[PDB]
Design a protein around this ligand. Structure first.
Ligand SMILES: NC(=O)C1=CN([C@@H]2O[C@H](COP(=O)(O)OP(=O)(O)OC[C@H]3O[C@@H](n4cnc5c(N)ncnc54)[C@H](OP(=O)(O)O)[C@@H]3O)[C@@H](O)[C@H]2O)C=CC1
Lengths: 169, 88, 314, 46, 375, 90, 107
């Protein structure tokens, strides 16, 4: 449909003008998916308004994905889906991040993001500032190296096995 | 809505809404287009507020189910504006 | 790299691993990933926990009997090395106490000859040197000398009781509490002993296959300290925290006790043979090839008794 | 198996049946000095 | 038994009240997304059954949509009718399992056995069309796998007409059974907005009375052409969610009628052989057919480089696929939204100060499945 | 800058060191009570040449979580005995 | 350097090397697509055989790993961030060549 592509286009322009201290570009994937960019420092302020009405009542994170790419000056590339209800439609803001720079946590803005901060922390190196409690999930205890680092072998570097002489795995 | 709490005679509270709106955003330099649009719709909706003392068709006028929620939407816009200039 | 998936040339044949030996040795083989052919006399069930130790095709149970000649020809039949272990302390009926230490090692030795087995190895207690008390030291001396007469290039283990938590030894004197006191023939220096231990002995055996030099040499395995038996048991109930009652006793009566307890059809807690296992001290000879000669250093008992006996604790 | 022979020339071998055997292939018979073994079927022709 | 085999909810309970439940997922993190990246699209599909395994079809449908958008390709309509049909039988599977085992957790014991007879009769259908009792890798990115056998639809008819008595009798053992009422009626309410902040999905929303639902809202298939009544809850207590489960069962049972009555003849895989492998009668007798067969299984199809987030009304909530084709035949990243994950995140807020049994029931109203959480 | 972070790590050593006997007690570990301490000191020597600004504080972030786990009885005898690599062939 | 941050055992940041290069065209192919774009293959280690079934059992943690890139400098810098030993190799684009159907018919 052309129509949706129109409305998303114009709306992308709309937000592009409303708050352009940080919207690097508002590309519309041709199959009707808008997606603006964000300077990594700018995460909270954008998303904040993204809940706040103008039309951007995009409540509820659908997810907090963390695409990786070995190239680029900063490899990890965070992504935020969002959904507005009354105007039933979805957008997708996203940023970028150094292996070492601590981007802030976005838990307060989208509310249901507490679990995700922990996820991406234990599936990646990236740290979220002002997060109440990053800690491991989806792993063993020690384990150490983050998976999903695009490098890092799927077979990992370790294995458990039970050993009778010490009577322990 | 389960969290939604019934609020009789919205209209007064509404007038406090849009007035607190225009006032708290009243500090916006004409620069950013935010003041432009947000005032644009705000004054339109508020114009309907004065225009529509009745509620039963009023929410057929704001084009939003249960105006009782959208007053809290505007409530969100109030803290929104509270953030707008902290963001400068 | 040596590892659970790692191959090694070993094709050990370990008779009677079902007991305190040699789940440990099979383990240290298993961490190497070296193949093993442990064969069962008993029942599959008790053997079952042996299974994890291997890696898919590694461990291979085989049915056998020590009495049939060809039955032992079975499990040796492709073994590169064979390692005898069999030995019940209290004499079963059908296995008369002598054959267990004589015939079986014998057939093992000569079949080790015929199959052209690359190495043969065998165990006997340090006190196997002939003595009037106890028929085990002597019968094992007989099979020792026999296999030496039949497979002379075999190295021979001489361990004066390995120390393990499961151990049939330390747990035993730990369990002597259950009767009440602890029967000492005359306390103190009436006898004195040393223990090699389960892991040190195991590591030593496989290292002995790792040693080219460990050919016909008769290796012997001894604890770091010559603990006196009285102070030893004192340390036993010092770690088991149970009340400690020395129980001085004329020497004959203890044997009256052993004769009393050999009666049970099952597996008796005590036996007159074990009664003679009690009061005879280990000899202190070090000049024979032994544990350190392998390059392994013994782990002191003093840090390791606790894990061994915690189950006895109230 | 006996070697099948046909006076014609080119023949098609499906390995027996339609859609239950190997992909249809035509075995040439340019040389009478040799049999025409099928690629998949393994059945000679001449 | 209440921990579903893979939960370690450590909690600092008082005398018998909980003070804070502390879920520790990852006890079944099989590690999926890393694996998916190394395998081509067609070889990645089974993982999805292995996800929300109670609801095995809808996951496949979620994926096949997720690719078809990237691939810009549309299934022949009959395929869409199957895709919705089994989407719905699966809707019934998850609801049966949910209401049932949620009952079993609070000791009802019986309704279980009354229903798994039926659920077994449904697996007779997965059995019949897919050849597997479950985990039926049957939905395809191109549409659907083999066509379904002639003898089936009357068989589905004969069952579907009689199922309603069963669900009804269940309802007689539960909905009035005031013991069951008292156990689950004031717990564990969630604020309708507060749901939205936590991003609760599906029934956990409707229980708090918000209107939203993806099949009506952003329909993806023939849901344009089916008519059914979404059942809104009210109080947001487990009880309302339960009635939503039941009523949604009945409604799916309405959908089955319509799909049976309008099930057009035509092909089922897409014509585009570049994406859908050729039928066997054909590949064995013409060159291009065999070649596209061969390459579809060797290298697999390429996808244009791109990124997307599809989502559909999986029975537990919206199921969400974010994936990024690099252009190669191996997808680069395939983050998988798990609706259960958000719910279980919201649990501890929903369950403070409640009695320890009630947290057990409330885990069940969350109708969570840990295989989906750990992805 | 460095040093400001080094104090952090010393604090961390205090915490670990003092906690260790409790670890051996509560977990029924039969490691020599000293050995855990020494091994702690060693693990502290493992990165005893790191010199980047932010990387070291990040190191104490990853250092907190472990004592965080042993204090909460998260991890176990297996998991905490894991550091000693005791089953490995030399 | 981020060696401490990665859980990778010291052995494999040490006693082995990456081997950056732009892959050669499969010569059986006439295609060119896969040729471009840097990738970061590691060195091979030991891989023996399973005593049973003859499978190629393998010890090394990370043999199969491989990573695409857009630019070589980015790749070298990449491995440097990892503190990796490396063997950078030149892009080796074929020289352009003259062609003429009529030169075949000189005489
Ligand atoms: N501290 C110690 O224990 C010391 C032991 N040794 C010697 O080293 C050897 C290893 O000791 P350990 O393993 O503890 O003793 P165990 O009794 O634990 O091991 C002997 C195993 O061999 C089996 N076995 C042997 N012969 C037969 C047979 N004819 N029929 C059926 N089963 C048989 C036994 O019964 P089954 O397999 O049928 O269950 C048992 O499983 C012993 O022979 C011992 O004399 C030496 C020094 C110290």
């Amino acid at each position: 449909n052309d129509v949706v592509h129109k409305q998303l286009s114009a709306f992308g322009q709309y937000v592009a003008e409303i708050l352009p201290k940080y919207v690097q570009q508002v590309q519309v994937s041709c199959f009707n998916e808008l997606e603006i960019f964000i300077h990594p420092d700018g995460v909270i302020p954008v998303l904040t308004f993204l809940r706040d009405h103008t039309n951007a009542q995009f409540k509820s994170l659908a997810d907090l994905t963390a695409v990786d790419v070995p190239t680029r000056q900063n490899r990890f590339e965070i992504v935020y889906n969002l959904l507005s209800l009354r105007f039933n439609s979805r957008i997708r803001v996203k940023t970028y991040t150094d292996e070492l720079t601590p981007i802030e946590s976005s838990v307060t803005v989208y509310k249901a993001a507490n679990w995700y901060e922990r996820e991406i922390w234990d599936m990646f190196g990236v740290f979220f500032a002002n997060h109440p409690d990053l800690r491991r999930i989806l792993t063993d205890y020690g384990f150490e190296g983050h998976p999903f680092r695009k490098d890092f072998p799927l077979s990992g570097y370790v294995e458990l096995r039970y050993d009778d002489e010490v009577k322990r795995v | 809505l389960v969290g939604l709490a019934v609020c009789e005679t919205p209209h007064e509270r509404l007038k406090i809404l849009y007035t607190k709106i225009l006032d708290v955003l009243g500090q916006i330099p004409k620069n950013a287009a935010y003041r432009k649009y947000t005032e644009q719709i705000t004054n339109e909706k508020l114009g309907m507020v004065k225009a529509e003392p009745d509620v039963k068709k009023l929410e057929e006028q704001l084009q939003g189910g249960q105006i009782e929620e959208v007053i809290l939407q505007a409530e969100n816009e109030l803290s929104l504006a509270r953030k707008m200039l902290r963001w400068k | 790299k040596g590892g659970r998936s790692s191959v090694s040339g070993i094709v050990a044949t370990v008779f009677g691993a079902t007991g305190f030996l040699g789940r440990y040795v099979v383990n240290h083989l298993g961490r190497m990933g070296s193949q093993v052919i442990v064969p069962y006399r008993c029942e599959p069930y008790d053997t079952m926990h042996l299974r994890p130790m291997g890696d898919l095709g590694q461990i291979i149970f085989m049915e056998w009997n020590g009495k049939d000649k060809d039955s032992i020809r079975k499990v040796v039949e492709h073994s590169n090395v064979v390692i005898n272990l069999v030995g019940r302390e209290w004499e079963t009926k059908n296995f008369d106490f002598e054959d267990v230490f004589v015939k079986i090692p014998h057939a093992i030795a000569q079949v080790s000859k015929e199959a052209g087995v690359e190495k043969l190895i065998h165990i006997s207690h340090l006190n196997a040197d002939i003595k009037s008390p106890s028929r085990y030291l002597r019968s094992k001396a007989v099979g020792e000398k026999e296999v030496r007469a039949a497979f002379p290039e075999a190295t021979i283990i001489k361990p004066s009781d390995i120390f393990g938590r499961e151990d049939r030894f330390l747990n035993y004197f730990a369990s002597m509490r259950w009767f009440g006191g602890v029967p000492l023939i005359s306390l103190g220096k009436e006898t004195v002993k040393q223990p090699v231990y389960i892991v040190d002995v195991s590591k030593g055996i496989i290292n002995a296959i790792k040693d080219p030099d460990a050919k016909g040499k008769t290796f012997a395995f001894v604890g770091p300290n010559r603990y006196l038996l009285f102070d030893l048991v004192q340390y036993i109930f010092a770690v088991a925290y149970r009340p400690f009652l020395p129980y001085p006793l004329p020497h004959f009566a203890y044997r009256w006790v052993g004769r009393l307890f050999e009666v049970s059809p099952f597996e008796p807690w005590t036996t007159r043979d074990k009664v003679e296992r009690v009061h005879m001290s280990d000899m202190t000879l070090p000049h024979l090839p032994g544990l350190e000669d392998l390059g392994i250093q013994a782990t002191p008992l003093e840090l390791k008794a606790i894990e061994v006996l915690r189950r006895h604790r109230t | 198996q006996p070697v099948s022979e046909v006076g014609s020339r080119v023949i098609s071998c499906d390995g027996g049946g339609g859609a239950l055997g190997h992909p249809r292939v035509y075995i040439n018979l340019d040389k009478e000095t040799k049999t025409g073994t099928c690629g998949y079927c393994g059945l000679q022709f001449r | 038994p209440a921990a579903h085999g893979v939960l370690r909810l450590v909690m600092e309970l008082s005398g018998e009240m909980v003070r804070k439940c502390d879920p520790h997922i990852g006890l079944l993190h099989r590690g999926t997304e890393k694996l998916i990246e190394y395998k081509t699209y067609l070889q990645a599909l089974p993982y999805f059954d292995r996800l929300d395994y109670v609801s095995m079809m809808c996951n496949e449908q979620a994926y096949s949509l997720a690719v078809e958008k990237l691939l810009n390709i549309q299934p022949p309509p009959r395929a869409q009718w199957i895709r919705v049909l089994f989407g719905e039988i699966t809707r019934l599977l998850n609801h049966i399992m949910a209401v049932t085992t949620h009952a079993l957790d609070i000791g009802a014991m019986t309704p279980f056995f009354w229903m798994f007879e039926e659920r077994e009769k449904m697996f007779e259908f997965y059995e019949r069309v897919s050849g597997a009792r479950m985990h039926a890798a049957y939905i395809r990115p191109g549409g659907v796998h083999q066509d379904l056998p002639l003898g089936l639809l009357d068989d589905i008819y004969e069952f579907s007409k009689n199922f309603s008595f069963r669900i009804d009798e269940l309802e007689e053992m539960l909905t009035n059974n005031r013991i069951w009422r008292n156990r689950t009626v004031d717990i564990g309410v969630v604020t309708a907005e507060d749901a939205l902040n936590y991003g609760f999905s599906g029934v956990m929303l409707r229980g708090s009375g918000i209107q939203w639902d993806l099949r009506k809202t952003q329909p993806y298939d023939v849901y344009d052409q089916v008519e059914f009544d979404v059942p809104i809850g009210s109080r947001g207590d487990c009880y309302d969610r339960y009635l939503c489960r039941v009523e949604e069962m009945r409604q799916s049972l309405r959908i089955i009628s319509q799909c049976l009555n309008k099930m057009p003849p035509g092909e089922i895989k897409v014509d585009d052989a570049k994406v859908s492998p050729p039928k066997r009668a054909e590949m064995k007798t013409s060159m291009e057919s065999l070649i596209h067969h061969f390459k579809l299984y060797t290298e697999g199809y390429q996808v244009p480089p791109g990124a997307t987030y599809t989502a559909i009304e999986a029975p537990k909530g919206e199921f969400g696929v974010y994936l990024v084709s690099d252009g190669s035949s191996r997808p680069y990243r395939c983050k998988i939204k798990a609706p259960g994950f958000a719910h279980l995140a919201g649990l501890d807020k929903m369950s403070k100060g409640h009695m320890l049994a009630d947290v057990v029931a409330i885990i069940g109203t969350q109708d969570i499945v840990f295989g989906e959480v750990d992805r | 800058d460095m040093n400001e972070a080094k104090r952090r790590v010393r604090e961390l050593y205090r915490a670990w060191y003092r906690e260790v006997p409790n670890t051996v007690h509560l977990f029924q570990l039969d490691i020599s009570v000293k050995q855990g301490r020494d091994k702690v000191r060693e693990m502290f020597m493992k990165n005893a040449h790191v010199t980047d600004p932010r990387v070291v504080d990040l190191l104490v972030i990853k250092g907190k979580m472990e004592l965080e786990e042993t204090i909460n009885v998260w991890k176990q005898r297996t998991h905490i005995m894991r550091f000693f690599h005791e089953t490995e062939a030399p | 350097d981020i060696t401490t941050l990665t859980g990778v055992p010291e052995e494999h940041i040490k006693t082995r090397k990456v081997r950056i290069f732009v892959p050669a065209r499969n010569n059986m192919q006439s295609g060119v697509n896969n040729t471009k774009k840097w990738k970061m293959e590691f060195d091979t280690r030991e891989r023996w055989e399973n005593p049973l079934m003859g499978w190629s059992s393998t010890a090394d943690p990370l043999s199969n790993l491989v990573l695409t890139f857009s630019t070589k400098e980015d790749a070298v810098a990449f491995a440097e961030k990892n503190g990796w030993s490396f063997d950078v190799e030149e892009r080796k684009v074929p020289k352009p060549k003259s062609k003429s159907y009529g030169a075949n018919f000189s005489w």
